[PDB]
Amino acid sequence: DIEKIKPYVRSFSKALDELKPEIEKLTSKSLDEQLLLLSDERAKLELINRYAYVLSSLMFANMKVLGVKDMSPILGELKRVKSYMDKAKQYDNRITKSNEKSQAEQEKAKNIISNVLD
């Protein structure tokens, strides 16, 4: 009964310890330094969304442990971040579609070469 809570606390505590080095790694330099070092715009978008994801997640985890009753405001930020990430996926799907089309043409070309000569 009393012993029921302890594995939950242990699990949470272990998760925190594992996360801490990763946050240090993530923040080893400023966001602006990381962005200025990137040439690819899609990589910039991924990094920015990743920061928003990690930050709002920490805030959510913090508020759960503080035992906040009204979770609607922070869950709103999580919904926002998910929506933003889906916007990015939809751009990726469009890129993928044109990649596949390009791969299809190239596979066609190789077959033309290989086949007719055979």
């Binding site: 949470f12 400023s30 920061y51 930050l55 997640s57 913090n62 933003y84």
Partner: protein
């Protein structure tokens, strides 16, 4: 978590564990045991420090409070995000 990105994996493990723990009867142990209550607050404070670490990474000028700070920063992050995606879409639609 079997997320091949290590950071995202650690983040989701923390989020799920925090959620699981809070769904248990924490208030009951809070009343019964002072040590427990202080330990949770210590963990909450670790989370806030990590959030502040990220916030300092974003607002690099350094030559309710946490909550408001967090809200203003999220608006800044997602403004950058919209800017970046608008540029990506502009390029591909002009192509």
């Amino acid at each position: 978590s079997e997320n091949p990105d290590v950071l995202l994996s650690r983040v989701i493990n923390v989020v799920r564990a925090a959620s699981s723990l809070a769904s248990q009867d924490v208030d009951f142990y809070k009343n019964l045991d002072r040590g427990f209550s202080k330990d949770l607050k210590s963990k909450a404070d670790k989370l806030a420090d990590m959030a502040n670490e990220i916030i300092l990474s974003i607002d690099e000028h350094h030559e309710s409070d946490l909550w408001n700070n967090f809200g203003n920063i999220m608006d800044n992050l997602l403004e950058m995000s919209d800017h970046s995606l608008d540029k990506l879409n502009c390029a591909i639609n002009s192509k």
